[PDB]
Scaffold this active site. Structure first.
Site, short mmCIF file in Angstrom:
data_model
loop_
_atom_site.label_atom_id
_atom_site.label_comp_id
_atom_site.label_asym_id
_atom_site.label_seq_id
_atom_site.Cartn_x
_atom_site.Cartn_y
_atom_site.Cartn_z
N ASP A 1 6.35 -1.69 12.81
CA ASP A 1 5.16 -2.20 12.37
C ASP A 1 4.95 -3.87 12.40
O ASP A 1 3.93 -4.27 11.98
CB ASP A 1 5.27 -1.67 10.73
CG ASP A 1 4.84 -0.33 10.54
OD1 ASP A 1 4.11 0.33 10.87
OD2 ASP A 1 6.10 0.24 9.66
N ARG B 1 -4.63 11.38 4.16
CA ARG B 1 -3.47 12.36 4.26
C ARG B 1 -2.33 11.98 3.23
O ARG B 1 -2.06 13.15 2.68
CB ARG B 1 -2.98 11.85 5.58
CG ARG B 1 -1.43 12.60 5.75
CD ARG B 1 -0.85 11.87 7.03
NE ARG B 1 0.56 12.71 7.47
CZ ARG B 1 0.58 14.13 7.34
NH1 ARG B 1 -0.45 14.97 6.99
NH2 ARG B 1 1.54 14.70 7.53
N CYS C 1 -4.94 23.98 9.94
CA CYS C 1 -4.92 24.93 11.19
C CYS C 1 -6.34 24.40 11.61
O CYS C 1 -7.22 25.39 11.73
CB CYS C 1 -4.85 26.23 11.03
SG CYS C 1 -3.80 26.95 9.49
N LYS D 1 0.79 -1.25 -0.02
CA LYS D 1 -0.09 -0.12 -0.03
C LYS D 1 0.71 1.19 -0.04
O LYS D 1 0.62 2.25 -0.91
CB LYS D 1 -1.10 0.12 1.13
CG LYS D 1 -1.69 1.06 1.47
CD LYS D 1 -2.89 1.05 2.43
CE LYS D 1 -3.24 2.16 2.92
NZ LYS D 1 -2.15 3.14 3.87
N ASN D 2 2.03 1.27 0.80
CA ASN D 2 2.64 2.22 0.64
C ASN D 2 3.90 2.85 -0.19
O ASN D 2 4.57 3.77 0.17
CB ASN D 2 3.40 2.54 2.35
CG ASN D 2 2.05 2.56 3.26
OD1 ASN D 2 1.19 3.39 3.01
ND2 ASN D 2 2.17 1.84 4.05
N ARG E 1 -8.47 -1.71 5.56
CA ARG E 1 -7.71 -0.76 4.87
C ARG E 1 -6.22 -0.95 4.53
O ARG E 1 -5.58 -0.32 3.55
CB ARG E 1 -7.86 0.66 5.84
CG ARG E 1 -9.36 0.95 5.71
CD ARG E 1 -9.71 2.01 6.78
NE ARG E 1 -11.02 2.44 6.53
CZ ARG E 1 -11.76 3.42 7.32
NH1 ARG E 1 -11.02 4.04 8.18
NH2 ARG E 1 -13.04 3.56 7.04
N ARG F 1 -1.82 16.81 11.89
CA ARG F 1 -0.52 16.31 11.51
C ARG F 1 0.21 17.30 10.54
O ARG F 1 -0.07 17.47 9.25
CB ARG F 1 -0.37 15.06 10.92
CG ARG F 1 0.89 14.36 11.44
CD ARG F 1 0.90 12.83 10.76
NE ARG F 1 0.09 11.76 11.24
CZ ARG F 1 -1.39 11.92 10.86
NH1 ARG F 1 -1.83 12.60 9.98
NH2 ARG F 1 -2.31 11.05 11.48
O1 LIG Z 1 5.30 18.04 6.92
C1 LIG Z 1 5.59 17.03 7.77
C2 LIG Z 1 5.78 15.66 7.42
C3 LIG Z 1 6.10 14.97 8.86
N1 LIG Z 1 6.17 15.45 10.05
C4 LIG Z 1 6.39 14.70 11.22
O2 LIG Z 1 7.13 13.56 11.00
C5 LIG Z 1 6.39 12.39 11.18
C6 LIG Z 1 6.47 11.43 10.30
O3 LIG Z 1 6.49 11.73 8.95
P1 LIG Z 1 6.27 10.93 7.73
O4 LIG Z 1 5.99 11.42 6.44
O5 LIG Z 1 7.20 9.53 7.95
O6 LIG Z 1 4.76 10.01 8.17
P2 LIG Z 1 3.34 10.71 8.21
O7 LIG Z 1 3.31 11.84 9.06
O8 LIG Z 1 2.90 10.92 6.98
O9 LIG Z 1 2.42 9.82 8.93
C7 LIG Z 1 4.92 12.89 11.51
O10 LIG Z 1 3.99 12.21 12.40
C8 LIG Z 1 5.27 14.18 12.15
O11 LIG Z 1 5.52 14.28 13.54
C9 LIG Z 1 5.92 16.78 10.19
O12 LIG Z 1 5.87 17.34 11.18
N2 LIG Z 1 5.63 17.53 9.01
#
Ligand SMILES: O=c1ccn([C@@H]2O[C@H](COP(=O)(O)OP(=O)(O)O)[C@@H](O)[C@H]2O)c(=O)[nH]1
Length: 419
Positions: free
Chosen positions: A305, A91, A115, A22-23, A397, A120
């Site tokens: 994982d 996402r 915001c 998937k990734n 999923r 994330r």
């Molecule tokens: O634009 C970004 C992308 C990632 N992260 C941080 O890095 C972690 C892991 O990033 P990754 O892209 O590996 O996974 P995702 O955030 O997409 O689940 C996140 O949970 C955030 O804490 C962030 O702060 N800003």
């Protein structure tokens, strides 16, 4: 509300074909946006996000088709916006961003809530594009990126490692003018796989899988055929399924080299492992597994994982084994569930102490994390009696019809409704 009704115990055994990852599939579909010619993306599993990406893509102007394959012709992209409606559930949508502006000169992706008090961060992508020469436009709920002409290769030092940003920046860089360097790039197999896909389309990429990825911008990206790499986590789950039931299993369409830590870890558990270039065999010889010690850590070390799964393994092996989550925290929520099944463990800080027991007992259990959720189903398999795993949509999923694969393995399992 889909539920898994499992009847145990049953030795899981035989054969299983691993779905595409998937990734790797996700980043590759968005990257396909870069392709000026039709592309056949093979080995793409049938998951909700695949469906969501396909929609998002159609919405962009790309002709999108699917089966084992997902056929993509992108040369008609005229809408440069992933609307709130489409990205709401996904996402990864953000991955529409870089391809759009790098190839077209503009891209606008919706930031659900954004915001929104809890969101994330998506900052890396936005900031990465910026370094590449993109003009950024920010307003609550969206992010617009544009550029007059080509993107500009740049030297980007990542302060936080990000699979996500790595795909964005690496993707856009293929079209930029000049060379782009990504320091502290994600090392995951899925990144290597996305990079390989790009190189397949004519991109110039190197260092994929290391801390430093170098991208030489090129003219255009063509088309072709590309097979998404196997699901390494899916493969581990299945290996574990046999390792805990004294089964013998062969993993078809696997990729051994993505599971070094997991394979070594299984050997420690006393499993008998053989590998080929596209298959992996695990044999317990009717033997109960041995307790093992595990430290999850950044790839290529032991993959977090695989945690819920190894935990389960420890929970039914001979001995005591500690599983330590070195990076992540609060990764043990599903353990109390296992305890309700007769397991013996103590969760202490970032670790779970395991006391392998002989046999588990059926119980109504539930978990949110797909991995933990999958481990429960696994437990249902080897446990005595009836196990009912709730809210299995989580597994739906990330796992391509785990019940079917499990049934062919000798499992007694029913997808049932509680609503
Ligand atoms: O634009 C970004 C992308 C990632 N992260 C941080 O890095 C972690 C892991 O990033 P990754 O892209 O590996 O996974 P995702 O955030 O997409 O689940 C996140 O949970 C955030 O804490 C962030 O702060 N800003």
């Amino acid at each position: 509300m889909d539920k898994f009704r499992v009847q145990g115990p049953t030795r899981l055994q035989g054969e299983v074909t691993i779905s595409g990852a998937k990734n790797a599939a996700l980043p590759i579909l968005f990257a396909a946006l870069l392709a000026e010619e039709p592309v056949e993306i093979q080995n793409v599993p049938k998951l909700k996000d695949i469906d969501t990406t396909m929609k998002l893509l159609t919405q962009l102007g790309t002709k999108v088709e699917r089966x084992g394959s997902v056929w993509i012709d992108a040369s008609n992209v005229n809408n440069f916006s992933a609307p709130y409606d489409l990205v709401k559930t996904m996402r990864a949508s953000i991955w529409a961003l870089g391809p759009l502006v790098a190839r077209f000169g503009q891209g606008q992706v919706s930031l659900p809530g954004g915001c929104a008090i809890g969101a994330r961060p998506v900052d890396l992508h936005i900031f990465g594009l910026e370094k590449l020469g993109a003009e950024i436009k920010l307003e609550e709920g969206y992010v617009k990126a544009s550029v007059n002409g080509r993107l500009k290769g740049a030297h980007i030092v990542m302060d936080k490692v990000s699979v996500g940003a790595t795909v964005t920046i690496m993707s856009a860089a293929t079209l930029a003018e000049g060379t782009t360097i990504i320091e502290n790039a994600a090392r995951e197999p899925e990144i290597v796989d996305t990079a390989n896909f790009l190189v397949a389309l004519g991109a110039k990429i190197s260092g994929q899988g290391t801390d430093r990825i170098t991208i030489e911008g090129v003219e255009r990206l063509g088309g072709g055929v590309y097979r998404v790499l196997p699901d390494r986590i899916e493969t581990g789950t299945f290996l574990v399924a046999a390792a805990i039931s004294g089964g013998k299993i062969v993993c078809r369409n696997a990729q051994p080299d993505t599971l070094d830590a997991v394979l070594a870890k299984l050997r420690e558990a006393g499993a008998d492992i053989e590998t080929g270039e596209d298959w992996i065999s695990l044999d317990m010889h009717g033997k109960r597994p041995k307790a093992v010690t595990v430290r999850t850590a950044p790839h290529p070390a032991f993959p977090t994982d695989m945690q819920a799964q190894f935990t389960l393994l420890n929970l039914v092996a001979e001995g005591t084994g500690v599983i330590t989550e070195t990076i992540f925290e609060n990764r043990f929520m599903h353990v109390p569930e296992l305890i309700r099944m007769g397991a013996h463990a103590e969760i202490e800080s970032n670790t779970v102490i395991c006391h392998g027991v002989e046999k588990l007992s059926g119980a109504q259990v539930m978990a949110t994390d797909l991995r933990a959720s999958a481990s429960l189903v696994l437990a249902g398999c080897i446990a005595e009696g009836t196990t009912v795993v709730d809210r299995i949509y989580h597994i739906d999923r990330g796992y391509e019809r785990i019940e079917d694969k499990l049934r062919a393995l000798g499992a007694n399992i029913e997808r049932v409704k509680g609503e």
